[PDB]
Amino acid sequence: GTLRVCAAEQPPLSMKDGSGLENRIATTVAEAMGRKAQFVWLGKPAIYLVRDGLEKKTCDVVIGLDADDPRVLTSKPYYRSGYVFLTRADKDLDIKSWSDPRLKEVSHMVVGFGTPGEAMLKDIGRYEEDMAYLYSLVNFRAPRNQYTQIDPARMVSEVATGKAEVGVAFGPDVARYVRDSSTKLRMTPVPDDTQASDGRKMPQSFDQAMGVRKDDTALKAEIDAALEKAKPKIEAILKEEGVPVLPVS
Amino acid sequence: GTLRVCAAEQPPLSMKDGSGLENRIATTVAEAMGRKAQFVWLGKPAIYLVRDGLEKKTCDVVIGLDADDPRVLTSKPYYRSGYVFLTRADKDLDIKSWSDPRLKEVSHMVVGFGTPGEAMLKDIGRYEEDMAYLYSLVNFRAPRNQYTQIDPARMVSEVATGKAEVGVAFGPDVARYVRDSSTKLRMTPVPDDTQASDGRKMPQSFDQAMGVRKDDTALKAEIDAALEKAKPKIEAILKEEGVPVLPVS
Amino acid sequence: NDKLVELSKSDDNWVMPGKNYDSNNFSDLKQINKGNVKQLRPAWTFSTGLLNGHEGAPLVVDGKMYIHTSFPNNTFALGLDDPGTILWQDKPKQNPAARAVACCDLVNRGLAYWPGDGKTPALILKTQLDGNVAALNAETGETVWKVENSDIKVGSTLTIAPYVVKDKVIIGSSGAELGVRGYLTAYDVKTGEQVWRAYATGPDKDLLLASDFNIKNPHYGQKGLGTGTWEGDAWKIGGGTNWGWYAYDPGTNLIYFGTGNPAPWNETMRPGDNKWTMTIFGRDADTGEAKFGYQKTPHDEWDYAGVNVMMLSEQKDKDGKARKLLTHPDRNGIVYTLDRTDGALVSANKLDDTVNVFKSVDLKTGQPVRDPEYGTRMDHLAKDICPSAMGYHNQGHDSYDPKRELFFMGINHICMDWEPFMLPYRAGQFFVGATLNMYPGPKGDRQNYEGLGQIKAYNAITGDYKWEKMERFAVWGGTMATAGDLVFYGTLDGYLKARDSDTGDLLWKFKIPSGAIGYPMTYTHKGTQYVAIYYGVGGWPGVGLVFDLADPTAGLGAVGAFKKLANYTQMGGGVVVFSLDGKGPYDDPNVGEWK
Amino acid sequence: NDKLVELSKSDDNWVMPGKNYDSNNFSDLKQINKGNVKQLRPAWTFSTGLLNGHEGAPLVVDGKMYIHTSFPNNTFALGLDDPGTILWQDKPKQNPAARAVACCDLVNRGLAYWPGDGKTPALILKTQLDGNVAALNAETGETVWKVENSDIKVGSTLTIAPYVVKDKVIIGSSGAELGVRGYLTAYDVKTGEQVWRAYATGPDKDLLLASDFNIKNPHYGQKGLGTGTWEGDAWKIGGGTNWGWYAYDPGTNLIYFGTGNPAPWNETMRPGDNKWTMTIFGRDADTGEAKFGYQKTPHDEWDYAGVNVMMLSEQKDKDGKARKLLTHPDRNGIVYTLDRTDGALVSANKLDDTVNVFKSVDLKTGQPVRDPEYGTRMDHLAKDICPSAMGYHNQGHDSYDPKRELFFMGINHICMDWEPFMLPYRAGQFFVGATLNMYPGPKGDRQNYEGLGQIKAYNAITGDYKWEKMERFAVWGGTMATAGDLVFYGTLDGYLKARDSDTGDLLWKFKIPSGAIGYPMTYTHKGTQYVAIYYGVGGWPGVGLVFDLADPTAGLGAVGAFKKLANYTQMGGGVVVFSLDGKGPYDDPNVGEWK
Numbered sequence A, B: 001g002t003l004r005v006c007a008a009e010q011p012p013l014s015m016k017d018g019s020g021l022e023n024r025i026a027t028t029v030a031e032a033m034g035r036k037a038q039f040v041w042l043g044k045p046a047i048y049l050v051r052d053g054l055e056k057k058t059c060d061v062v063i064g065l066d067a068d069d070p071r072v073l074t075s076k077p078y079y080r081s082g083y084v085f086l087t088r089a090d091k092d093l094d095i096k097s098w099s100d101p102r103l104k105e106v107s108h109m110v111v112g113f114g115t116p117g118e119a120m121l122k123d124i125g126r127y128e129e130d131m132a133y134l135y136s137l138v139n140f141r142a143p144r145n146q147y148t149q150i151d152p153a154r155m156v157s158e159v160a161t162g163k164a165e166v167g168v169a170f171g172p173d174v175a176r177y178v179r180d181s182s183t184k185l186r187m188t189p190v191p192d193d194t195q196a197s198d199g200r201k202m203p204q205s206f207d208q209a210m211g212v213r214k215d216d217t218a219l220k221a222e223i224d225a226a227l228e229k230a231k232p233k234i235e236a237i238l239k240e241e242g243v244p245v246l247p248v249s
Numbered sequence C, D: 001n002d003k004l005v006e007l008s009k010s011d012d013n014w015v016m017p018g019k020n021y022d023s024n025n026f027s028d029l030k031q032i033n034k035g036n037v038k039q040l041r042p043a044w045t046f047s048t049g050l051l052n053g054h055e056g057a058p059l060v061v062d063g064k065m066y067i068h069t070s071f072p073n074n075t076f077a078l079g080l081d082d083p084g085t086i087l088w089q090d091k092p093k094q095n096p097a098a099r100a101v102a103c104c105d106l107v108n109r110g111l112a113y114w115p116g117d118g119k120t121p122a123l124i125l126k127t128q129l130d131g132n133v134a135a136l137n138a139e140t141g142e143t144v145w146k147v148e149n150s151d152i153k154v155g156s157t158l159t160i161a162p163y164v165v166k167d168k169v170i171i172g173s174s175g176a177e178l179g180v181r182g183y184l185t186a187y188d189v190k191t192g193e194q195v196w197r198a199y200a201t202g203p204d205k206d207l208l209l210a211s212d213f214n215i216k217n218p219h220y221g222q223k224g225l226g227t228g229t230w231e232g233d234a235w236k237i238g239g240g241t242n243w244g245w246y247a248y249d250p251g252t253n254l255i256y257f258g259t260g261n262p263a264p265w266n267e268t269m270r271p272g273d274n275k276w277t278m279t280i281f282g283r284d285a286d287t288g289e290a291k292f293g294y295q296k297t298p299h300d301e302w303d304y305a306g307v308n309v310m311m312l313s314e315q316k317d318k319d320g321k322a323r324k325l326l327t328h329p330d331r332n333g334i335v336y337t338l339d340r341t342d343g344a345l346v347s348a349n350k351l352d353d354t355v356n357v358f359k360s361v362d363l364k365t366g367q368p369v370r371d372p373e374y375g376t377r378m379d380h381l382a383k384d385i386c387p388s389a390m391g392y393h394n395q396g397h398d399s400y401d402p403k404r405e406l407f408f409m410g411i412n413h414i415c416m417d418w419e420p421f422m423l424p425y426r427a428g429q430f431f432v433g434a435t436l437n438m439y440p441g442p443k444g445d446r447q448n449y450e451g452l453g454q455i456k457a458y459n460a461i462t463g464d465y466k467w468e469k470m471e472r473f474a475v476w477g478g479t480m481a482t483a484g485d486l487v488f489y490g491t492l493d494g495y496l497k498a499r500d501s502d503t504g505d506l507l508w509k510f511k512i513p514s515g516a517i518g519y520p521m522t523y524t525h526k527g528t529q530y531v532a533i534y535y536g537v538g539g540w541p542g543v544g545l546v547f548d549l550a551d552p553t554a555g556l557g558a559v560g561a562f563k564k565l566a567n568y569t570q571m572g573g574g575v576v577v578f579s580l581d582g583k584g585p586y587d588d589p590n591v592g593e594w595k
């Protein structure tokens, strides 16, 4: 047999050479199950995987996805992760919560688009002091019909160079760059109990699992049996990348 | 007092910041003198420095010039060097002199412009197979008015990657990149007594010294007398850089 | 000025954008009339050396012609006796990072002229896209002063033409798509120091309102609406930049202009009324205090922009009372006329009978009547929104005939479909967006994507149109009217057309190297009348040809709408000058040769 | 072909570069003459969309107009009834790395047309400087076959026009400055297969010499000189590329062309005679065997090139015997005439009396007489050496009048200064070079840097000039001659000029957007005669405009000599078409309008 995986070029999770974390996980699970893995490439970014990869019957499975997603059926969870605070060390500047007053005297902050961090910036009252900077992190291009996002390399580089005092990022996305950074940095988990002024409850830590189509049910059994088989290799690889991991509740 | 020495941007010999080998030698010499060293910079390459700077009283002395040169007065030599062959250690292509027949079967070789290496190439009848490659190393632009040359870093990269099997280069120009090369590259001095087809003598080992203007006779004697105080520093600098010093005999 | 008006009266000069302070583009020359139009053939031409869109018109003063360019913002001065020789040129050095902040294309819209007093010589005023303002000597070409008004790093671009009033020069701003707060600045023309500066949103101190603001019409708004109509500190990034044309009246000593759209593009993120955005302002010149302001589209949700041209006139109303008026077309399909002194509204009419975003406009209260079916924020697909985001009008310069009392204008015929969508992602991340499509209207041909333009003659007081005629693509540009029964315009096909004032029949058309997006101008040198026009295609409709794009949805849908422009024109740029029988300076071939 | 000649007989077509197989550039139209030339005004114009040099002339066949362009070498087709519409277009794409290997500018010469038998339709043949040859269908525009000829890696670029003979196409080569050994190739036009290839240097097998090579003139050279004149294996990197024009004769079934300069530039590194470089060749078509060859400048040391145009004629010599002649101008200031059949030398005259590099040319032997004072290798400053490297003639296409028996030519007036130098360095390293300067000749003004061109009428057998006139800049380009006493040409200033045939007086001049480096053409469509010409500056003289340089010693001194061209013209590119009174397809303005 064989395995077909829905793939898109998105560093550092998935790369053309196959050296990314997601590609390694897919190859390891395919080897554990005993079927070869074929990596079909879709030109569009990852957000378009479900609409044009699975509904078009071109590919079969997505290596990483959010749990409890109503669009497609999802397998059993296998790792959790959250958002992290990135700070530049040897500045006696320690940040542990969004309620700390010192966050309002920082010159700039780096946070992605369409992210709860942006909502937090709007809540604390500093979005108007960082809009131009955020549009300058990437070139001043952001069409309303196309998806744009700041890559982790720019974020970590601007944190290291001292232009931005503190950053808020996703765990698995920024592990390699901070690990290999020449300037020593500091990563701290964000508390999962975040209180909004209005009262909305949106968490900061999420489960992740891979999914298949709605009609198929045997594929889910094969996938989660293989995932049960390949627990220690996956855990060892994850510890090799050094990403922060939280226990499953 | 100020030394007021002339400098040009010729990597790796001299750079703007001040990490070039000539810069270290000049700073150590000035520190031995007891006076601070001053730099005067010309935008033109080093080959012009004698004509434009020294003879127009813009600068005072040069850093490195060959001895017994009729142009200007020369100080006592402080080191000696010559051309060297560069090859890969794994390929087991050992070359001892220009008389090795195996140099005929080699696909490509790299030498400079105006060097004795080009004369040796013309003596063994390989110029027609290498002219286009040499002209393509630098961009296809060698006007008859200006001075053009191949970057030593490009030469080392080309020999290491595999485009050219054998290279010939001058020691101090490529010693730094030879030391800090990930690929195992081996180098070998060229024999001094080499005969061309006609039989004319052409050497391969040259001394190097420091030059002063003809009128300045007190400074020449002063520099000669006060340079004798600092052999070990110069020797340590040469050893740290990695130049293959050949003792004078 | 007390000297620029007299220069404007003479027929040998073209001193300012609009040819006068009323901005009517009207000449009083009759040598080219309906008797002799078939003999209009070119006299001479020049090429700039650039490949983008060329906008605006040249300047002709005291026997010299001044020409401006696209992105490098070069400037050329030529003598009318021997055009082939260049008297002087100015080529600046600029960071090639300002191309990443331009919204739509690298364009400029003209130059300014100052005659000067006895001590200081005459000056030419120029703006650069980096955000610099400079003054050059009009006879030699050096620099007297140069200052900066916009910052590239924040995202502020400057493509508007300078405008000279008395002893001061007025500078605007652009870049509202990036969320740039708009402002207007006045500078001393001799030295370069700043005199006053005004904003569009914020506390009343920054707006510089007078003590009698909107006293005749209290229902428009009086005070405290620059922050109250917004929620929180949104007004710091609200927008409202002006990049259009000005008007000036010496009797009232007032400057009239408009303001652009707010930011961001999503109407949900900025809930309120968004006051003093898309507003007609009449302000003072010496101190900059505002005298009146009227709102056209409160809380816009279709991405319009009210920065079009305004034209002053004097006419008798329905009751028979003489009044001084300003007329203003807009991008939403309604043309307004207002009283120049106090700001009362006289009439508001519909450009075409196929507009379905507004049913009518109420004159007593000033509030338009909306149609909910053809509006956005409907949470699903919306069809047949006429006009589109391009609108029925744009940065062109229409014309006015006072003896006949008619307005000559060019109108687009474009309609839009809007499709909102939301896409989830991994960790609480969602992407909200909109896909927009444009297509020809009901009176065109949707199957073959042709029939996207019209030209009309209009009467404001009565409201009826004398005549209207159809075109292939939109008239991205302006018109110009002459004394004897004639109007001129250009087309993106690469044509210069001359029409009839009272019947509209086609009379003359000629082919130029590339399509034109400027407006024609005319002058006299020595008993001979010349008509000059730029050529070179660009702008929003030409975005698909400049950057070589093939996606139909690129440029909000402009690539799909103008997909047939490639097999009719290419790029270029330069100036062409026509005359009767093509007679010009080189009639004797022994002028301008060596030895 | 047996259809191409009959097509050329008709006066509605211009089917090949040169208008016929003799490259005479002569028409037989008398509608435009001395009586009515002052009434000539433009009819219509086009802009292509690229800013570089433009060489060659368009083609007009079967009621359609075919137009080419410079890098990236696009092609367009147009209809004469409605010029505005573009029937089809072709846009190739190739590696941008080809920009850095061209010597002088990114240019091209022309296209070719093949009528077709019953099975295979008509074809258009084109070349691309990445080293590619392509054929397209003349009606639809689809591609039939595409082949590769040169290698960019070695430094070979293809900027020559194709040439169609019978059922074959001939392709040359370029890139002699970098050491490329020149060659000529023949291909089939239906399929694209290779038939034969010939080389300039090397052994006789590569030369393709017939058994009777130079039988009538043994003193020119017979055998073994491909390698005998050189020393060692230098002929592998010798040179000799051909990038000019060809001529064909069906009676003798021969093609005539020339060969380029040797390499490298230093004359001390290639001792010998360097045979079969800078040689006039007459070769066969089907087999390619060389019928004859004649060398002009043995052991060149001034960087000349024998790639100029060749014309064919029939004339009576001094003895009164009718003979068939080929005439060839050269860069060194000598014009040659030869017998087509056998290659005997008839005469060789001087282009101007200021030439000091050759005293005279011996007709009995064929060896020029040299002056040691005005040569190189003297190891000292040598002054006033002209004709210079640019020469008194270059790639232009001159004209011949069959009736008057005169040649109309454009000449340059430049003199140069040579200074060699040698610089020592660190360790047995030395650098040898030369510095070159250029300036106007004795008949111009060195201080003001003007007076660099001439236009002349010449007779071959008699050897006297009927008239000669002088201009401001060099006449870079060619000429076109008509039946009634007119000669047309173009100028770098941006002018089209028409002169008199029997007196030399100036009759007409017009200002086009930019200068011309091509030659004009004329034709007829419906009882009306049209004159078309390209515009756009470039080539060797315009280097300072294109790459924006300032050092007077750059470009082998060409920047300094043309320092005044910046304030007379700018860039551009396109085509313009003139007619009497400016009448054309748009006289009735309802043609080409929507609906």
Ligand SMILES: O=C(O)c1cc(C(=O)O)c2c(n1)C(=O)C(=O)c1cc(C(=O)O)[nH]c1-2
Pocket (backbone or CB within 6 Å): C103, C104, C105, C107, C159, C174, C175, C176, C177, C241, C243, C260, C261, C305, C390, C394, C395, C539, C540, C541
């Ligand atoms: O908000 C802005 O700053 C801004 C600037 C410009 C501009 O500078 O051209 C345009 C617009 N908006 C705009 O919405 C628009 O329709 C438009 C058309 C053009 C053009 O050059 O054709 N510019 C602009």
Ligand SMILES: O=C(O)c1cc(C(=O)O)c2c(n1)C(=O)C(=O)c1cc(C(=O)O)[nH]c1-2
Pocket (backbone or CB within 6 Å): D103, D104, D105, D107, D159, D173, D174, D175, D176, D177, D241, D243, D260, D305, D390, D395, D539, D540, D541
């Ligand atoms: O040796 C060559 O391959 C070669 C090519 C070309 C060329 O193709 O333009 C020129 C020359 N040489 C040359 O010497 C020269 O003066 C020249 C002028 C021009 C021009 O287009 O104006 N091309 C060339």
